[PDB]
From a paper:
Here we found that the uniformity of thin ice relies on the surface flatness of the supporting film, and developed a method to use ultraflat graphene (UFG) as the support for cryo-EM specimen preparation to achieve better control of vitreous ice thickness. Using such a method we successfully determined the three-dimensional structures of hemoglobin (64 kDa), α-fetoprotein (67 kDa) with no symmetry, and [name] (52 kDa) at a resolution of 3.5 Å, 2.6 Å and 2.2 Å, respectively. To verify the imaging quality enabled by UFG support, we prepared cryo-EM specimens using 64 kDa hemoglobin, 67 kDa α-fetoprotein and 52 kDa [name] applied to the UFG and collected cryo-EM datasets for single-particle 3D reconstruction. All of these three samples of small molecular weight were mono-dispersed on the UFG with high contrast.
In the cryo-EM reconstruction of [name], fine details were obtained after a routine 2D classification process (inset). From the dataset we were able to obtain a 3D reconstruction of [name] at a resolution of 2.2 Å. [name] is composed of four monomers, the densities of which were clearly resolved on the 2.2 Å map. Furthermore, we were able to identify the water molecules from the high-resolution EM map. For phenylalanine or tryptophan, the benzene at their side chains appeared as a ring-like density with an obvious hole in the center. Even for alanine, which has a minimal side chain, its methylene group was unambiguously visualized on the EM map. The 2.2 Å cryo-EM reconstruction of [name] indicates that the UFG support can improve cryo-EM imaging quality and that it has the potential to facilitate the determination of atomic-resolution reconstruction of small-molecular-weight biomolecules via standard data processing.
Numbering used by the authors:
A (entry chain D), B (entry chain B), C (entry chain C), D (entry chain A): 16 to 134
The structure:
Amino acid sequence: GITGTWYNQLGSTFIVTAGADGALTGTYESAVGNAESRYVLTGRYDSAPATDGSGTALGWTVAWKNNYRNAHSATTWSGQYVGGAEARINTQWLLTSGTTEANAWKSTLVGHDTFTKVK
Amino acid sequence: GITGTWYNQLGSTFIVTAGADGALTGTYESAVGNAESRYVLTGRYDSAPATDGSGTALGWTVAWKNNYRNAHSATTWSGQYVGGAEARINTQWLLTSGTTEANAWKSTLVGHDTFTKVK
Amino acid sequence: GITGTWYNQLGSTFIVTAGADGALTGTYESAVGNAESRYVLTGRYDSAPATDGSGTALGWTVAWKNNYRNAHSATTWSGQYVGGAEARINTQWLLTSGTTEANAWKSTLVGHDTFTKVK
Amino acid sequence: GITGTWYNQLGSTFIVTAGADGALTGTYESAVGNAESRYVLTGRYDSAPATDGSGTALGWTVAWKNNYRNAHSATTWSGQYVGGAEARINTQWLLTSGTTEANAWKSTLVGHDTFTKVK
C-alpha cells in the first residue's frame, strides 16, 4: 500500500510508485521546496520488511530543479511506512543548500513531515 | 567531477554515476549499513549549480537490503559536492529503522560523513 | 507564559521555571529518557523575543542520571515557544549516548516533540 | 578533564566548568552564533560515566542574547566527551530560530562540531 498519492501536514503532494526491485519513483509539489511546480523524486525502500508488525523503512531525495526553477538545494526524507487502517509515512528530512565554504555551517535544515493518503 | 569512486572517513566506498538529467546511481559497501556487501543507491543532484563558487547540493538513499542481508533500515545522505583541487562531498545523514509504534521515538539515527576521492 | 508544566505527545511532563536572566530550570520525567524518575533540566531562552509575532527560541538539556538510574546519555531539545490561545513548544531533539569510538557513528538519535500545557 | 577551555574546528571558544552535581556552566564566543561577543551557556553531563571505555555524554544550550546583541535563536549541542591523550568533545547541534508559523519548517539548522583543548 506504499504506492499511491500522499499528502503531508502542510499541503505537499507526494505521488510515488514503489517497484519490486526496491526502487521508488515519482513527483513532488507544493512548498517546502518551492510554491507551485513538480519535481522528480527517486529513492529506495526495503521490499521485504519484517512481519512482526513494524514500519517499512524508506527514503527518497528531491533535488529542487525542474524546467521552471532551480533553488540549488536538495531534500532527503528518511522514515518508515506504517501500514494499517489509515496508512502513514512518518519522516525526518534534511534540506541542504549549495553554499560557499564560509557558509557551510548553515547549509543544512532539519525537520519532520508525516504523510497520509487523504486530503 | 561528481561521477567516480568516493571514500568516507570510516572506510565506506561510494561508487556513483551522475547523469545529465540529475539522476544519481551506484553502489555502497562497507559498514554503517553492514559489514561486507554491496547495496544499490539512488538519488538526485542539481545538474546546473551556481557559478559563484558554491557546493553542488545532492542527496541519495540506500535501503540496506540485497540478496545477502536485510537490516530493515534505510540511510539517506544529504550534502553538497565541493569541487576544487581535492574533491569533497560533505554530508549529513539519517538512518531510519523499521520499528513498532512504541519504539518509533528511537527509530532515527543522525550523523555526518565526509567523502574524498582518495583512499 | 513559558513558565509552567508542559506535556508532550507521548506522556512526558516538563515542569519548567523561566528566569528574567534567560535561565531555564526544572525537572523532566516519563520516558524517552527512562520510565518513572525525575531528572534535572537546565537550559536557556531569549528573554526579549521579537514582537512581530514569532516563537520564543529556547533550548534545554537533560542528562539522564539521578540517584536512581544512569543511562549514560543526554538529550538536548531545541525549539521555539509559540504563544497564543493554546500555548505550544515545538522542539527537535538530539539524544547522545556515551559510546566507544567504534560505535560513535550510532551514538546520536534524533526526533521531535511538541509540548502543550494540557493533559 | 571536562572542565576547561575548548576550541572547535571553526574558531569558537568554549570555556566550561563542570560541577559534581552534573551541572555545566560557562561562556561561548566566536561565530556560528555571532561574530564577537560572549554568551552564557548552561547544560548537563552525566557525572558517573561507564568505565568500559566510553564517552561521557553531555549537552548544553546557548541562547544567542547578551547585552550587545539578540539573534532570537538558540543552539543546543549534544555529544560525548572522549577522554585520552588528546581530549575531545564530538557534538551534533541544532540551531532553532524564532519564526512565524508559516516559516516554522525552516526554523531549525543542524550541523556538527568537534572540540579540542588546543588552539
